[PDB]
Structures are given as C-alpha cells and as structure tokens.
Ligand binder design. Structure first.
Ligand SMILES: [Zn+2]
Lengths: 100, 213, 116, 135, 133, 149, 54
RNA sequence: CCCCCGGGCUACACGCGCGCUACAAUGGGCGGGACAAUGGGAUCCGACCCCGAAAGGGGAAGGGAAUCCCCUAAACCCGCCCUCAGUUCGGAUCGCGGGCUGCAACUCGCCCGCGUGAAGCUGGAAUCCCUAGUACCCGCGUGUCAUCAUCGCGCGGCGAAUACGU
C-alpha cells in the first residue's frame, strides 16, 4: 500500500526541487510520506596520466563524477499518483517508482 | 611457561606496570632532576602526543622513553661495536608490545639480582652515563675544534641511546637475549664498571673534550 | 625393447584414443580431449594416405602445437621454424611431445667482444 | 639406552637428533615423507633417536622398499607413473641419481629443446637470460 | 536507570552502557580481566583503577566496539568508560583527577591518516624512490 | 558458565580432551598424510590434531553460527612463504572442515539450516557450557576477580 | 579475393577494442562501459561531467 | 597500402639503475586465540550443499547494489619443539606427476604435491629518503585483464627519534 520513489542526480538543485514538490503535494493533500532519506553518494574516479609521451616526470589527473541519491515512501493514494506522475522531471534527474 | 597469575595480572594501585613504585626513588643531579619524569602511572604509553612541542619530552615517563629507544633496529649508516646492525624484517619497528615486555623482564631480573628498585638502578645508571663535548667554531674565517658544555636534555638522550645500543650490541648474533643484555648494561653502568658501553663512551667523550679546551 | 608405461607399440597402435590419453601427461590429455582442428586433421589425412600408397611426396606443415601419436612413428615430417622446413624423423621415444620441440627457432649464441 | 649414531640403509645417521630429522640426511627423503613413514611404522618421530630397535629399522626398510603397499598415498611419492612400468615408486639416492641421468639422457637422445639446454648448461624452463644468471 | 556513551579513535567506534550492578565490565561479550594483551588490558582498566572500588563495585558496564584495530578499540572503550562514569556520578573530583592524569580520557583524539601521493603512493605521502644520477 | 567467560585456548584444549570419548569422531584414512592447507610448509606435529581441529570448529559454529565452510576456510588460512616472491594470504582446504562438521552432526551436536549454514543443538550447547563451568571453577583459584562473573 | 580484406571478429585481446574517436588500439579506458583512449578522455571529460574535486 | 599463416620483441661471455627475498633468536615450525578500510560486481560477484589430499570440479539462493557477494587480512597474543649451527636459517636451480584459461600453451603462460637443496655469517670508496598519526614494519583493493602483479594509483593496521636552527 506504499509506493517507493528513488531519485538520482548529479545536481542537487533538481533534487531539492522535486522533493519540496512532493512534500507540498502530500501536505496539501491528506497522505503520508516518509523522508526524504539521503543515501550514500556514489563517486566515480578515473585517474590517468597527463603526458601524451613517456618523457618527463609523471603527473596524474584525478577526475571525479558524483551522484546523489534520495529515497521516499508516499503511501500510494489515488490522487497521490495522479498528482505526482505529472511533475516537471528535468533531464539531469532519474526517477524510479515501485510498489510494496 | 608464564604462570597464570602473571599472564592475567590485575593492578590495584597506581604503579609502573602495577608492580614498582616511585616515591622511594630519589634523583641527586640538580641538572637532571627537572627532566626525569617520575609521575605515578600504570602504563607508559603516550601515543606520540608530546613530540611537536619543543620541550615536550620532559612530560614523558623515563620508562616510556627507554621503551621507545629499545624499539629500534640497531645501527644503520654507522657502526656500533665495530659493525653495522641491519635487521630490516626481523626488527621490532613500530612494535611497542615487545619492547614493553623486554623492559619488564629486564626490570624483573634487576630486582632479582640487586634486591633494590630497578627504577633507582636506572636513575643512577643515567646519572653515571650522562656526559658533561667538543665541536667546531669559527672565530672569523678560521675554524677551531673547541670544547663546549652540554645540556641536560641532550645528556639524557645520549645516555638512553647508549644503554639501548649496549644491549643491542651484547645481544647480536649470540645466545644471550635482549632483556638479559639490558639488565647487564644497566647494572654495570650503575656500579661504574668499564664493562659498559655507556660508561665507556662517557669517559671517552670527556677524555677527548679535555684535550681541545 | 621400448615400453611406454608397460605397453608396447603394437599395443598402443590398437588402443583407442581415450585409452591412450590416460597414459599421457595432463597437458596432452586436455589438448586431445578438447579436440583437434582442421589443419591437424588434414595433416592426419595426409599421414594416413602416405603410410599406405597414395601419397608419394614429402609432408610439410606449419603445425607445431600438434602432438606425436603412435600412428606417426616411422615417418618423416618437415616442420616450419619461421624460415625453413626442418626434417624430423619421429622415434618411439617422442610420444607425448609437440613437433615444435624438435625444430628450433633461434641459433646458438657465440659471443664476440664488447664494443662502445 | 640411546645409540648416539645409528646406521640406516646406506647412511650412518646421527642419533643425537630426532628420528624425523635424522632420516632427513638421506637423499630422497624429506621431513614430510619421513613423518609419513614413521606414522605408518608406528614410531614416535618426536623422540630422541638411539633406541631404534633392529626390528624398527627393518620395518622402516620394508616400507621404503615399497611404500604404496603399506599405505603411503601415490601422490606423496617421488616418481609417479614411471615412464617404463607405471607402478608409482619412491627411490632413495641411487637409482634416484641414475633416474635423473636417464631422463636427461633420453631428452638429449631425441634432440629436444630441453636436452640441448641441458647440454649447453643454460636455464631450461622459461627464464629470461639477459641480466641475471652470471656463471 | 541506564546511561549510554560513545567513543571514537581512529576508524574505531565504541558504544558503552552503564547501569546499576556489582562491578562487572564486558567488552564484546567477554570480561575485561581476561583481555589480552596486557598493554590493552591496562589501557582499558586505568580509569576504573583511578575511580576506585567504592564507585565501580556498584555499576555494570557493557561496551560494543567495532572498527580499527585492537589498540584503537581499547582507547575508544577507555574514553567511553571515563565519560560514562563521570556522567553517572556527576562528580567533579573525578573529572579533575582524570584531567590531571590524561585529558584525552574525556577529550578525544582527532588525528587521522594523511592521504597518499604519487612517487610510491603505496608507502606514503612523503616517502619517495631514491635517485643515483 | 558460558563460553564467553573463559579463554578459547584452555577451552579448546579441554574440549579436545573430552571429545576422545565420542565414538562418532574418529580421524579418517588420510589424516596422517596431509597438510592443513597450501599456505602451510610442514604437516602437523601433534598426533591428536584432529580432535583439536574438531573442537575449534565446534566452538566456532557456536560463536559465529550460522556459518558455512568458506568462512571457516578463511579463518583457518593464513600467510605463505612464496620464496623470492612476496607474501600473500591464502585460504585453507575444505575436506577437513566438511568431515569435522559431518562428524559433529552424526554425533548430534550441530544441524544445518536449510539454506544458510550450520548451528549447534541444545546438547552441544550444554556440552560446551558444562566444560566451561569446570574450567572457570578451576581458574577462580588463581584469578579471584572472575568470581563475580 | 574479397575475403582477404576484412578482419576476424576477435572476442578477447588488445585487437578487440578500439577508440571510437581516435582509432587507437592499446591504452583504452575500460571503466564503466567507456571506450576511449586516455588522450581523448582527458580531452572530453568535462563535456561528460567530470571535474577536479581534489 | 589492406588481410591471413608461421617466427621475433622472451636471444646472453658482461657494465648499470630501480626493486623482491635473505644472510637468523629484536628468530624458524606446528597447533590454538584475535582484530580493518578503501573500492568493485550480468553471461559479472557468486553465499549454501555435495565431490576432491591440494590446485580445482558439479549444482545453485540472491544481487543491477546502505538489501546479495568479493571479505573471520597480516603483522600481534598463548603453548610446545629447535639453542647460535651453513643449522629445523636460506631458498635459487632440476626430475616425475596432477589442473585452469584459451582457436592454439614447444619456442613462450599461471597454480598444486613429492623429491633436489646453489650463493649468502651485516657489507670499502661513495651515496638516498625522511620533521608526526610523519618515517620505519604489515597486509588488502583497484588499473591492465580470456589467463598472468616482485609494477602504478590508493586503503587501513601498529607506530617512533631528534631540531624548533644555519
Ligand atoms: Zn583516442
């Protein structure tokens, strides 16, 4: 009877946006939500050598891509889904919803 | 084997390792009195907290300093007793447990053989192994080998290093152990026997210094 | 008399493949179980033709990872080393070996005198 | 009641040492094979040698003559699947030397890579001979 | 009543719980009197020996500690135990005693590892290969 | 009174001394001809090492159960001398652990949860706790600080 | 004639992976389904979103 | 220029740089007792059961990763054997056998067992790196990768000596 929402993004602006949206929805309406819950940030590190040749002292570039993760549970009302599915979902955010 | 009343030892009073007191110990050199820490403790382990501060070594218990000296490999980049002592994989480097135990056994032996407090013994040994040296000074263009006096803190460092090196010497590739060697060194230096590396080098250093006065 | 692990030639010849492979070492057993290949099999056809009649020419090949079987004894096979086809006459004591062990690639080094 | 130097097959081993370590002075026997043989014979390897009864020695020899029949798994043996007979066997010193010799000589007799390396005296397996292996 | 405390030492975390009892102390289900080695046992029991019998024979303490080595675990447990005792007693003589003895009982230790850098990263940040020119 | 109030050394020793009366626990055919792992150099020196190994496996299934064979392998493995190459950690062998656990089962001291590991039974629990009670009564003679526990 | 012009479909080895930008063979970042040489990745990383964060 | 087969870059009287292992008791072996972090994971990680002495083999829950897995690290502690010896130090080289990856393992791969058992007894002239959770000591992950790490990039464990100068 509860629906679970997973949010993933490289930017926190869109995340704050979507989460405040869902909070306003579930507060103006009568329906319960647990969260939002911050999951551990997932970072991808790629370390490579600068030089295109083999001469000179060796120096290394450390490149890092960060991914933030949020979780919510929304209680799965009918108006809930109808008013949640139609929200501005920018392109820098990935959303996945499932049932329990 | 160690008996159980020694393998599982529980202290009740504030005492070095729970066994040996300090109130009956008395220093006599007014130069070294203020740098020989005799605070009542149970575990001489400071976890490297007093290194950054310049004079932070006067707050460390003598036993902890000795343990840290004993925690060594020997003699690299210089010869001691005639030869390099390089172990490099069978050395107790960054292993304070073994040095703790070595010092404990040595203290036990000293107590057994002397019927006194090993801390008093060690104090007199330091007093007798601390040298009162020469260097190179330029009075303008020209340089001379001069004789200069020494400070108490460097005296202590010298004495402790020399005692530990004497032990590492007498335990080198021989049937003797490090604890027995350390006890021998300490008794010898305390009763002023030339059998001791430390008393020997003290006398040699003062001898040379006397020349270049 | 030659005996490979108790058995003679005339016995190894009539023995099967799965029985013979039990006598070899692990490596050759694994190879011979995983199976031969088109090249190796064309060479086997050539050999079976030559040992009786039809084939009246020398047997040359690039196959060096091929294993010496009892059916190959009594023949001469020219194996490539990278530059030339070296003749190898296969003796009974070769059983269980690769043809490349009897055809070397590099020459013996006879050193001179250093330079600058 | 301890013989100070006992005389076992071919070799006059030292009695001042334990049996497991004294038997080690024989070519073809390590500490592990020795422990095996002693556990089969029923002797305490952890005891000072010297009280090695004649019958104990004879039983050790009985075993060393044919270990598999007395147990001794075929995978703890020196020469499994002998090239000429099968018959997993364990040799001590003499046909040991001679068997090394015969193996190398059969490798030379067919003109193989390994035989030629043995002849010239160079590394046999795969090593890189440019920086090390200096006579 | 019950009280809970915590302690940190590099990569190790300890949680202690104190209540009324007889004088028992357990670290990961086992008594502190059979903790090995001696250098860790004395570390853990130094605050108890400073507090004394008339205070420790009336409480029971249980510590769950995980992460980062036996010496770190022992230091963390020592810190937690000192804090729990000081709070449970709300006594200031004990706090003065502990501070004059060692102020890292109640205060923690902030030191962590420095990250490693190239030219022999494995060894450390400042260690490097040697040259011979 | 419990396994947690005494050390593992004396307890494993005494448990191995006591397991010599259970007829379902007997060394197998190949026990005197093997090492305990590839990380080992020489094979065991004691003649009654089977019982010590079984007792340790038993205490481990008690403490850290439910547990299977690979984790016990990891516990019983160790460091290796690889020659001129540097040292690495390697895991132990499995047949010894399997046979030990099967024997303890046949004796009715452990059981397998259908899908995750093996646990002890009440009689095994009583076995261990009685032995520990004996040992603790002995130790209290020396360490009077253990009486309160 | 027309067969001896195209390469076999290798499944493993240095000759089974190219860089889609440069065409190189050897030193290819393999991490997370990415198929780029170290040079090309170091050139186009920010446009994919990687940063300093050191 | 573009493709296929076979060889070579792995050749060795020698001179050098950087390292690994040691020349033993501040230890070797056997059996017992403890204690992490970083990262990664679809024909991928593979718990759990069964075979196998070992390496490895047959099934297979779950897991697209705060859920499952890689993962009970070593140094350390306890007891017993060895007691200053080219040895129970050291471990190169060689023989027989058993396996994995892969279209293919001789040239030219990695692992396991039994045997074999070479130099080396602390190192001249000269020279390198290191000011605190630093240096020394210990092991692990990841990159490369069908298979192969004495390397690079990182991770934690134990943890000092000296100077606050010229
Ligand atoms: Zn490119």
């Amino acid at each position: 009877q509860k629906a679970r929402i997973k949010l993933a993004s490289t930017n926190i602006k869109a995340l704050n946006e979507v989460t405040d949206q869902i909070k306003q929805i579930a507060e103006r309406t009568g329906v319960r939500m647990s969260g939002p819950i911050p999951l551990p940030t997932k970072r991808i590190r790629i370390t490579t050598r600068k030089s295109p040749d083999g001469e000179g002292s060796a120096t290394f570039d450390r490149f890092e891509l960060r991914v933030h993760k949020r979780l919510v549970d929304i209680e799965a009302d009918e108006r809930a889904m109808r008013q949640i599915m139609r929200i501005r979902v920018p392109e820098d955010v990935t959303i996945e919803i499932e049932l329990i | 084997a160690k008996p159980l009343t020694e393998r599982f030892f529980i202290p009740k009073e504030v005492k070095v390792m729970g066994r040996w007191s300090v109130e009956d110990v008395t220093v006599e050199d007014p130069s070294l009195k203020p740098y020989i820490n005799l605070d009542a403790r149970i575990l001489p382990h400071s976890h490297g907290r007093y290194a950054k501060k310049p004079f932070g070594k006067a707050n460390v218990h003598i036993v902890e300093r000795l343990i840290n000296k004993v925690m060594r490999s020997g003699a690299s980049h210089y010869k001691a007793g005639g030869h390099f002592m390089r172990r490099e994989h069978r050395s107790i480097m960054s292993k304070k447990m073994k040095a703790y135990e070595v010092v404990k056994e040595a203290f036990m032996i000293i107590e057994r053989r002397t019927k006194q407090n090993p801390i008093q013994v060690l104090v007199k040994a330091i007093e007798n192994s601390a040298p009162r040296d020469t260097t190179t000074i330029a009075f303008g263009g020209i340089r001379y080998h001069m004789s200069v006096d020494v400070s108490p803190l460097r005296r202590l460092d010298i004495a402790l290093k020399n005692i530990a090196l004497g032990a590492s010497i007498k335990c080198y590739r021989n049937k003797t152990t490090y604890a027995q060697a350390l006890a021998e060194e300490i008794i010898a230096a305390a009763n002023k026997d030339p059998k001791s590396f430390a008393y020997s080098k003290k006398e040699e250093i003062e001898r040379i210094a006397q020349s270049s006065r | 008399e030659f005996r490979y692990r108790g058995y003679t030639l005339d016995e190894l010849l009539n023995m099967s493949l799965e029985e013979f492979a039990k006598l070899l070492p692990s490596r050759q057993r694994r190879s011979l179980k995983r199976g031969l290949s088109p090249e190796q099999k064309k060479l086997l056809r050539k050999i079976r033709l030559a040992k009786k009649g039809k084939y009246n020419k020398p047997i040359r090949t690039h196959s060096r990872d091929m294993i010496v079987l009892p059916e190959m004894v009594g023949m001469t096979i020219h194996v490539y080393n990278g530059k030339e086809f070296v003749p190898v006459e296969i003796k009974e004591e070769m059983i269980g070996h690769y043809l490349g062990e009897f055809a070397m690639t590099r020459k013996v080094v006879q050193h001179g005198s250093p330079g600058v | 009641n301890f013989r100070h130097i006992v005389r076992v097959a071919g070799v006059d081993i030292d009695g001042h040492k334990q049996v497991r370590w004294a038997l080690t002075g024989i070519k073809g026997i390590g500490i592990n094979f020795a422990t095996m043989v002693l556990r089969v014979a029923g002797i305490d390897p952890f005891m000072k040698a010297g009280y090695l009864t004649d019958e104990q020695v004879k039983k050790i020899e009985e075993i060393l003559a044919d270990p598999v029949a007395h147990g001794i798994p075929a995978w703890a043996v020196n020469r499994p699947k002998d090239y000429e007979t099968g018959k997993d066997m364990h040799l001590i010193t003499a046909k040991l030397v001679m068997a090394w010799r015969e193996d190398v000589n059969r490798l030379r007799r067919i003109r193989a890579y390994r035989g030629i390396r043995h002849e010239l005296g160079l590394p046999v397996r795969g090593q890189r001979t440019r920086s090390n292996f200096r006579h | 009543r019950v009280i809970q405390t915590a302690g940190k030492r590099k990569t190790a975390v300890a949680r202690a719980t104190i209540r009324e009892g007889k004088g028992r102390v357990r670290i990961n289900h086992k008594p502190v009197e059979i903790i090995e080695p001696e250098i860790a046992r004395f570390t853990i029991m130094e605050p108890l020996i400073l507090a004394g019998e008339e205070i420790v024979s009336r409480v029971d303490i249980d510590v769950k500690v995980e992460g980062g080595g036996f010496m770190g675990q022992a230091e963390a447990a020592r810190v937690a135990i000192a804090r729990a005792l000081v709070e449970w007693t709300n006594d200031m003589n004990l706090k003065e005693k502990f501070m004059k003895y060692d102020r890292t009982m109640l205060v923690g230790d902030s030191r962590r590892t420095e990250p490693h850098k190239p030219n022999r990263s494995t060894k450390g940040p400042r260690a490097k290969r040697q040259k011979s020119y | 009174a419990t396994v947690y109030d005494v050390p593992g050394d004396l307890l494993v020793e005494r448990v191995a001394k006591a397991l010599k009366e259970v007829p379902e626990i007997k060394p197998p055919e190949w026990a005197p001809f093997v090492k305990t792992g590839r990380h080992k150099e020489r094979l065991p020196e004691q003649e009654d090492w089977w019982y010590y190994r079984v007792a340790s496996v038993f205490r481990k299934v008690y403490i850290d159960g439910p547990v299977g064979i690979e984790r016990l392998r990891t516990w019983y493995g160790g460091r290796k001398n690889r020659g001129h190459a540097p040292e690495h950690f390697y895991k132990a062998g499995g047949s010894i652990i399997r046979k030990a656990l099967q024997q303890l089962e046949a004796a009715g001291f452990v059981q397998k949860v259908p899908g995750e590991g093996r646990i002890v039974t009440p009689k095994g629990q009583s076995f261990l706790d009685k032995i520990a009670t004996e040992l603790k009564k002995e130790l209290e003679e020396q360490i009077p600080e253990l009486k309160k526990y | 004639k027309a067969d001896y012009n195209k390469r076999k479909p290798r499944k493993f080895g240095k000759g089974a992976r190219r860089c889609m930008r440069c065409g190189q063979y050897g030193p290819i970042i393999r991490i997370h389904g990415l198929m780029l040489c170290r040079h090309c990745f170091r050139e186009v990383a920010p446009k994919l979103g990687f940063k300093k964060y050191e």
